[PDB]
């Protein structure tokens, strides 16, 4: 019997061509039911967004017989591989590609009935309109900002753009470049400085939705551009971050943060990384260098896709069935099917093992919805460092268990209101008077400041026969300042 | 029709300080305003109506 | 030789064919340039936003050897076809289906 | 229909050039495929059309 499987991985198939046989070797070594049996594999590394390049890699491997297909592709490039696995009744294991650890987006497919899930998405789902509805309520929000890069399909929580009208809060939304210097370029050059400081104080509540890499490049510089003086919150929740780049964000930060990733209990011991008499290669059962923090989500969803197959093929060895797919052209519509696919559909969709990622059940429409984090958190402080304390835990079962300035002042003449009180060498130094004392009452309990500007008109600016305002009013209107808070002659 | 079809207007209604507020539209508005009456209270209904 | 082109259309492909087949019909009645040959067509109808049926319904058309291709399908029926028409150098005048 | 009009115009311009080639019958499931080598000057005929 031709025991062959295919496995096509597009760009980047680098850890796909590195991590893959860390279980395949231990399949051929450490499995007793697949002892007196022979174990093969496949590794492809082809170019990205190329479905028909993968077609001649799929129509050639279909000639050799394939028992299970593990992929890592995207939405538009895999509806063909979706509909390939319907007629021959073949499993289709899948990872959604993302560039650098940015968020993900589900797909949309043919008008076929629910129940057929030959394609199965290994990755955990976007449960994140929910967690957004958590934090828009549990963390005192009315007016804030969110972001996104150039390189993500932005439609992930486009649903959450809709409850935003229903609550009544305000969100800001901008795209992030692929150059951080171009971001600070457009935020220091292309705009209005008064509109900038408005947007900056709006930016004190802001959200990036990004990869952990270019955001790590941005955020500590956004700190270093003094966008945080004392504290406010900025948020991102993800599934993967290394502990140094955690600390290189949030120990390079005193303010309120959000750094959330994905945790699972793993096993330290030999004969405890074992499901279906097969080894789980991990740090605690295969310790390597640079591998204390190798935290990609595709690890456990490949070693457990191995164990999910190792449960089912032992069951299929008990099923007493075999059929070899022959050499064929994929021009056919009424193709030769595989009869063992019905049992292979049922020993896998109803197949499950409980391991170091919890329990891996399956539904009938390409999803494993079960997922659980934990959350360690801290606020602004200096007496203990920014070391972490548990404040919440989310799961798909229960929800989030545990819960959560120099200003622009132009002024008027005539010292009997407010005077130039001090005039020193080089500087008319301190300007006192009535509304200065008012400014003192403003500045006193906050530490927030001012910048006094001269209008040598001292106009009490008047609506002219010009459809305009002489002196001071029309340039508050023309916005070279925005506040002229003084003794101001009351006219409607 | 998606939000990725009009991605940058988020970023420019941002820049002019223009107050963005979306709601996705489903099939029939006969199904819409009934669920607006059954689920919401009247404060979020008629304050946000104006 | 002869002209032979491909014509694959998403559901509903009825008024794609109301436009195409009657448009190709009136050509040979009146033209003096395409009278030495004739445009030969064969309609291959596929699923809704399934490029896999477009591959199976077009491999016979390249077994027929089509010179060009007429498509009215959605965005989820062109990624394998863009990865195919870059191989056969075929002018792929793709037009996106309006989703309802 | 405009894609029928442009390509039939490119048919007329190609016979106005008085050169012709036709695509061969092939099963492209094979790696052995012949690329259509006249894919540029006829593409110059079709891009500049109106």
Curated annotation (Swiss-Prot), chain C:
Q: Where in the cell is it found?
A: Postsynaptic cell membrane
Q: At what residues does the UniProt record annotate the site feature described as Essential for dimerization?
A: 52
Source domain of life: Eukaryota
Query: What tissue specificity does the UniProt entry give?
Result: Highest in the pyramidal and dentate granule cell layers of the hippocampus.
Complex and partners: Homodimer. Interacts (via extracellular N-terminal domain) with CBLN1 (via C1q domain), and more weakly with CBLN2; the interactions mediate the trans-synaptic adhesion complexes also with neurexins and are required for ligand-gated cation channel activity.
Q: Which family does it belong to?
A: Belongs to the glutamate-gated ion channel (TC 1.A.10.1) family. GRID1 subfamily.
Q: What does this protein do?
A: Member of the ionotropic glutamate receptor family, which plays a crucial role in synaptic organization and signal transduction in the central nervous system. Although it shares structural features with ionotropic glutamate receptors, does not bind glutamate as a primary ligand. Instead, forms trans-synaptic adhesion complexes with presynaptic neurexins and cerebellins, regulating NMDA and AMPA receptor activity and influencing synaptic plasticity through signal transduction. In the presence of NRX1B-CBLN1, forms cation-selective channels that are proposed to be gated by glycine and D-serine.
Q: What is this protein called?
A: Glutamate receptor ionotropic, delta-1
Q: Which organism is it from?
A: Rattus norvegicus
Upper taxonomic lineage:
Eukaryota, Metazoa, Chordata, Craniata, Vertebrata
Name of the gene this protein is made from: Grid1
Covered range within the whole protein?
Answer: 22 to 121 of 1009
